[PDB]
Structures are given as C-alpha cells and as structure tokens.
Amino acid sequence: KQLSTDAERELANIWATVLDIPIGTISASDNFFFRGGHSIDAMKASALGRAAGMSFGVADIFDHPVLSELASVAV
C-alpha cells in the first residue's frame, strides 16, 4: 500500500531510521509494533517527528499504531 501524503512520507522515513529497516519496505498500512518497535523506539520516533515539524507523542503511537492513522493525528 503506497504512501500518499507528505506526512506519511516523512513518518516512513522516521520509522526507517528508528527501526533500522529500509524505506522501500514501508507501506501505509504497516504497524509500528509488528515491524519491531517498542516504547523506546516510539520515544525516538516522536523526537524525530518534532525535528521534522510533526507533532505526536508516544501515546499517539500506542493509540494509532498504523502509519497512515498516525500521520492524520500528527499536527
């Protein structure tokens, strides 16, 4: 499933760095925890989010574990 918004793209790049998985393998329907993330990865993702101008916290990643859903609630 293809990345469709700018937020989805920026978020995928963040997941790629934090999970050390290649960007090409990330689809919009991917689940952060199923791809191997845990609470500490989520903390790092959230911080990298801020540096890219997105805004979400660790709780948002637990509530919206799927990439496309997380990209909507980021501000």
Partner: protein
C-alpha cells in the same frame, strides 16, 4: 537563564569555597547550579557507581589522542563536569566549565594484566571511599598500559545520577567519533532537561493537568509493602511470544501484578516502575546525556468479579495503565504524592519493576584495533525490592535485587520463579481466563 533554579543565593561563593578546600579544581568556573532530581538522589543514596572498561589491543593505538578524547568528551557533555553537594539536607548539582581533565595513568610491570590492576584499584579504594555528596567530580578516567602500549585498558567511572540506558550508548559513540575525528551534531545537556520540565509546570499546582491526572489515577488506591547484604537472583526463560498489540514490558508488569494480587490479598495493586522520562517536546531529548529516568506508580485493578477476565484483558488493562501516564510520567514522585494524594510526600516505593528495552551490548569502534567491553558496578538497595527484566536473543532474564534483610535467598529465588512462570503461562495461552 542560568542560575534561575538555584536554591542558593550566592552560587559563586559555594564554588569558591569548594575550590579552597581542594575538592574541585581551582581553575574551574561555575557555569550553572541546579537542584538534583529525586531520581538522581535515589541512585546517589544507593552508592550506584560504575566503571566502564575498554580493553584496547593493537599497534596503531594513539595514547595522546585517547587523553585528548577524554577532555573533549567532558567539554561536550555538561553532566560529565557536574559535581554534587548537599545544601540544607537537599542535593544540588554544580555544573563546572573550564574544567581540565586529568587522566589517572598506570604503566604496568612486564607480564602484569592491566585489568587486574583496574580491579585492584576499584575494590581497594575507588568504590569503598566513594563520597559523591562531598562534591568531588564522579566522572574520572583511568588509562592502564602494558609496556609497548599495544594492550591498554581505558576506564570511565561515573555515578548513575549522570546517565541512563537510553543515553549511555551515546557516551561511547561520541567517544569513538571524537577519537576517530568524525563529525558530531550539536546536543543539549541535562540542565536543559530540568529547565524544560519547569517551564511546562503551571504556577498553581491544583490547575496542573499532571497533578489532576495523578489524583484521579490514584484515587482510592493503597500502596502496600509486599516485603519487610545486597543479593542478586537470576532466572532465564525462553523468550515469550507477544500477543498482538502487547509489548514485552506490559507482559512483565502484568505478571508482576497478578503475582502481587495473590501475595497480598488484593484486587487493587500499586507498585513502582521505571520510565524513561523522555516523552517531552524538547530538542534532542532522545540523545542528551543524563539520568532522565523516573520511578513512578503503576496501578493495576482487577475487577471484583474477575470470573471472565482473560490474560488478554489483563494485558490490555496493564498497558493502558502505562500509556495513560505518558504525558505525566516526568514529574518528581514526591510532588505526585504531595499534590495528588493524602500520602506522606517521602513515602518510598517498595517494589520497582524495570524492563530493560535498551541497548544491552556496547561498542567503541576505534580506528586496526580490537576493543572489548566489560564493567564493574556497585548498587545497594535500601528497603525496596527491584525486579529487572533483560530481553536477550536467546532468553528473557528475570533479575531480583534486594537487601537480604528484606528478601532472603530462598524467598528471592521463589519470587523469580513465580514471575517467570506467570510470564511463560501468559505467553503460551493469552486467551486463557485468570483461573489458570
């Protein structure tokens, strides 16, 4: 705005006094002065002190560059040039600048093992005479060499008030980059973390969402004490398979809650757990060096009629009881108890669970050099019991650490076994009902 959190009127006079008693170097300056956090203090009171040891072998090793790297590392991270002291019974931190780092150096006899020399210094004087609250800098370097300088041990000593699991790897990767002359991004320091916490607090404490959250979260709760030389007890199990949507940490905490439920006679349990303290919107919060850890209450409430609760129900509940607190986990525990409960502010946590989902192995890729890691460690609990869980590739290791007067060997062994057994049972059958 440096010194804006100082609890002392003339911070510069304190520094001058310490210089004149030869506790800190006379050519240092005072860059800042702040209160020490409760978590920093937990570690300092328990003598928590480490020596991170790097055995380096090869012909290309450059001793001058090692020395200079120690100096540069301290210039970069202000927690590493922080001194701790008490004022009116309360611990503060002095952040020094213009600090010259002096490496303790040993040139061994032929045939002498450098590591045995480090061990001898460690046990003979380095930890037995440790007095962090006397104000002497806890961060110090030692370099022990065989003749020829092709086999060297480098040592960094440090108080646990100065690092945590998220950030310690950055100390080693920064060291390597500076040695290798690789470029480094700018970073923040621990002081910036303390200023950021205070700026997000509200001046009226009854209007702070955080203390409102804790008040509701802990309403009607009671914190029981499950248990009345320092001992470590270990127990390995096969790595658990994780039910969909559940983290390993949740599994460990649910197991602990079930255990306590039975051990006490209670459906409503509160115990402590370790959180990373880095879920805050501040620049470089993921990488800054310091101890941002916090030990906070976790509450798990079984229904009065749990007949139908499954393991999954317990897992989802336990996980939600952690995530509800994510935005509020960063405040001092004594402030939680003072502003959000009837409990005495200095009420201690008696059981603390730490899940170690951080780096467990370390590297120092110096440029051909063979570099091995090892460490020495002191940690002595007071009346509390600690349960650590380490997730390795081949096993999940459950570790119990407590004083023997609180938990004797047989009791500790049984605790480790029970928590392990419950974790495995949860893993192999998550759809089961709690009447196992």
């Amino acid at each position: 705005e440096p010194f804006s959190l100082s609890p002392i009127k003339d911070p510069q006079a304190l520094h001058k006094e310490l210089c004149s008693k030869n506790v800190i170097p006379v050519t240092s300056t005072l860059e800042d002065l702040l209160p020490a956090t409760q978590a920093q203090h937990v570690f300092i009171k328990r003598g928590t002190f480490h020596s991170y040891n790097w055995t380096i072998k090869g012909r290309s090793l450059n001793m001058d560059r090692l020395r200079e790297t120690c100096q540069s590392l301290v210039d970069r991270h202000s927690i590493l040039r922080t001194s701790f002291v008490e004022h009116e019974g309360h611990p503060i931190q002095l952040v020094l600048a213009n600090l010259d780092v002096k490496v303790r150096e040993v040139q061994c006899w032929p045939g002498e093992d450098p590591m045995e020399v480090c061990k001898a210094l460690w046990d003979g004087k380095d930890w037995p005479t440790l007095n962090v609250l006397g104000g002497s800098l806890p961060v110090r370097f030692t370099l022990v060499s065989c003749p020829g300088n092709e086999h060297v041990v480098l040592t960094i000593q440090i108080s646990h008030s100065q690092w945590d699991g998220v950030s310690i790897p950055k100390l080693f990767s920064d060291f390597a980059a500076i040695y290798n002359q690789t470029p480094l991004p700018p970073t923040s320091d621990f002081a910036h973390y303390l200023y950021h916490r205070v700026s997000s607090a509200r001046e009226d404490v009854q209007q702070d969402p955080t203390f409102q959250f804790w008040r509701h979260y802990l309403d009607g709760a009671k914190m029981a004490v499950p248990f009345a030389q320092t001992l470590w007890t270990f127990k390995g199990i096969v790595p658990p398979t994780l039910p969909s949507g559940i983290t390993m940490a949740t599994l460990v905490k649910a197991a602990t809650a079930l255990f306590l439920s039975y051990h006490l006679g209670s459906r409503d349990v509160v115990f402590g757990h370790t959180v990373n303290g880095r879920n805050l919107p501040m620049d470089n919060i993921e990488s800054l060096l310091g101890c941002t850890l916090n030990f906070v209450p976790l509450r798990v409430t079984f229904p009065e009629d749990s007949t139908d609760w499954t393991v999954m129900d317990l897992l989802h509940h336990t996980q939600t009881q952690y995530t509800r607190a994510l935005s509020h986990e960063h405040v001092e525990l004594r402030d939680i108890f003072q502003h959000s409960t009837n409990w005495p502010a200095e009420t201690p946590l008696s059981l603390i669970v730490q899940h170690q989902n951080i780096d467990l192995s370390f590297s120092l890729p110096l440029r051909s050099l063979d570099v091995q890691y090892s460490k020495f460690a002191r940690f002595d609990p007071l009346d509390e019991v600690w349960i650590f869980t380490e997730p390795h590739a081949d096993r999940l290791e459950v570790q119990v650490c407590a004083n023997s007067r609180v938990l004797g060997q047989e009791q500790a062994t049984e605790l480790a076994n029970n928590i392990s057994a419950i974790i495995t049972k949860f893993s192999t059958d998550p759809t089961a009902r709690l009447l196992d």
